[PDB]
Ligand SMILES: *[C@@H]1O[C@H](CO)[C@@H](O)[C@H](O)[C@H]1NC(C)=O
């Protein structure tokens with residue numbers, strides 16, 4: 001379980017690489033009716 | 049009355065909304081404001097920690113101060129080569145001074161500062177690649193026109209403004225209480241005058257140097273205590289309680305002035321002209337966006 | 349650009365306070381009851397649920413306003429100052 | 445006279461004048477989280493909103509094709525009308541018939 | 542019949558032919574910074590166009 | 591916003607702090623508000639008791655392995671509100 | 682585009698180079714030309730005398746701290762010209 005930036009692929013590697021990569025379009029997800037880059041200090045605290 | 053002596057000033061803990069753990073926290077480094085007015089992409093950052101000064105406060109380049117959130121909440125000092133600025137990739141640290149940073153940064157939607165080995169803190173700030181003239185470019189070319197633009201100065205002793213400074217108010221530590229067996233006490237650290245103003249049954253204000261029984265406070269939730277000898281100035285950030293006296297005790301410089309300079313802008317391909325009656329057909333070649341402006345030489 | 353600088357909160361612990369109308373630019377000030385603040389070190393007011401916070405805000409020119417500023421002018425009628433060259437008698441005379 | 449989100453939203457007699465005046469639509473809000481921050485919201489600066497759609501300046505949109513310069517404000521090399529010249533030639537250039 | 546910024550702006554009878562002829566709109570400019578580079582500006586390749 | 595501290599190699603079940611006492615939440619209505627650890631901010635070394643509102647140690651703290659402090663978030667319903675706890679480990 | 686050199690542990694005020702003499706610019710109109718170092722390319726170890734147009738040492742050059750060379754830029758107005766100077770530090 002990992003938190004990742006937006007991208008079009010997912011790669012898992014064993015450094016020192018035997019990496020593997022698959023197509024997965026992940027995007028930044030919302031909770032409400034406002035785009036936000038990251039949650040702000042002042043808010044409504046909705047259920048998600 | 050601008051002061052350049054940082055021995056009278058302490059850094060402060062700043063509450064910022066996106067720490068490394070993806071939650072707001074109190075951090076020794078907190079971005080108050082970010083300005084991007086230069087034409088070369090350099091950004092100026094105001095940070096809750098000081099830079100280029102040692103724990104005492106003397107001018108000591110490559111070592112910086114920060115108020116730590118550990119058990120001993122005092123000023124500590126650390127190396128400047130383990131600090132990073134980034135927006136999408138790492139940023140080139142152009143300059144630093146007390147409360148202020150200046151850096152070349154790539155385009156991005158956020159600006160973050162971290163103390164590696166982490167205490168990262170991030171703010172929303174939309175910075176983009178900027179023009180200087182009427183032609184788009186990544187970097188200026190070898191062949192150009194060298195037009196006048198304005199960039200942030202890399203020399204730290206210039207002044208783009210001033211910030212007012214004030215005395216710090218009460219801080220009300222939680223570790224100064226001894227709720228036990230229904231009665232509460234005070235923890236003075238090494239016999240210091242940590243004062244108290246609290247309301248067991250009525251407003252009782254006193255100063256204790258030793259551990260002291262309270263007259264009527266049952267639980268510890270209705271009584272506080274804080275230090276008194278706090279004669280170190282602080283920036284008027286909205287993340288601290290102001291004192292009863294909140295006058296401008298001093299004023300610090302705002303470094304990295306917006307100094308005019310020359311800087312090259314490209315010259316596009318010279319268009320060829322075909323002449324037809326009352327008009328010209330211009331044939332245009334431009335790899336990057338380029339502005340064309342025409343106007344008639346008459347009344348309209 | 350304005351700086352919209354925000355001063356430090358004025359917090360007192362269950363005493364009702366109000367703020368005087370300052371003459372500073374775009375001065376907006378409000379009072380909030382029922383606050384119980386936390387900065388680093390725990391609770392800042394002993395008193396339980398009647399404390400008052402004072403929020404202050406006012407605007408000010410940005411530090412980079414010395415270069416990035418627009419000046420508003422009212423323009424009245426204009427007058428000309430033309431430079432002439434007079435080549436009378438193959439004798440050049442330049443004047444304004 | 446000031447409007448939020450418009451040019452001239454913040455005004456003063458000079459850059460260093462004490463009498464700054466502005467009517468930006470600034471509102472303070474209740475702190476939802478139990479901290480000591482000041483939550484506020486405010487309309488966007490009308491300076492940037494004017495730079496977004498300032499259009500083209502007078503150096504590109506001007507009749508009779510003459511260029512605008514500043515310090516002092518002037519329009520150099522304009523070509524529109526006619527100047528009556530009354531010129532008194534000295535008699536040292538006039539020669540005998 | 543070459544013209545710049547269009548197909549066939551460079552021509553030859555073979556890839557290894559020495560007789561290559563072309564009329565791309567290339568111009569040489571006076572160098573501004575006092576170095577030894579050759580500032581030139583040319584019309585875009587009509588092959589890629 | 592709750593700064594708590596623990597010692598080095600503290601045993602299981604030892605005291606870390608009292609969340610409800612310091613936040614002023616009523617103890618006898620904690621269960622009605624759904625007092626629960628936020629799933630995003632979970633520390634395997636520490637737990638909390640839902641009934642008593644007390645944060646304590648789950649696993650023995652290894653100073654070398656975890657490093658640098660721990661962060662744990664809590665949330666309550668009706669009304670909906672989260673809170674943050676930062677825990678320092680001494681050496 | 683100019684190349685200068687300095688020795689290690691040079692004191693304050695020691696000679697590095699003559700920018701105007703190397704570039705052919707006349708000294709007596711340097712004030713009218715608006716001679717000045719570019720605000721971007723500045724180093725804390727080397728400065729310049731503007732009346733003589735002579736680039737020299739300001740701070741004692743720490744070979745370990747700076748490293749790898751030093752870059753400086755100067756500019757003049759009417760005509761608008763920009764010039765670049767690279768300084769090697771020996772060991
Ligand atoms: C603490 O306060 C007392 C008040 O009587 C004063 O005498 C003393 O000098 C102060 N400082 C200490 C004990 O360091």
Ligand SMILES: *[C@@H]1O[C@H](CO)[C@@H](O)[C@H](O)[C@H]1NC(C)=O
Pocket residue numbers: 496497
């Ligand atoms: C105004 O700024 C926005 C960015 O929010 C941009 O997309 C737009 O092109 C600009 N101009 C106009 C005329 O809306």
Ligand SMILES: *[C@@H]1O[C@H](CO)[C@@H](O)[C@H](O)[C@H]1NC(C)=O
Pocket residue numbers: 436437438439536537538
């Ligand atoms: C015009 O030129 C003639 C011959 O070149 C010269 O003698 C005369 O001085 C000039 N006219 C005047 C008014 O000086």
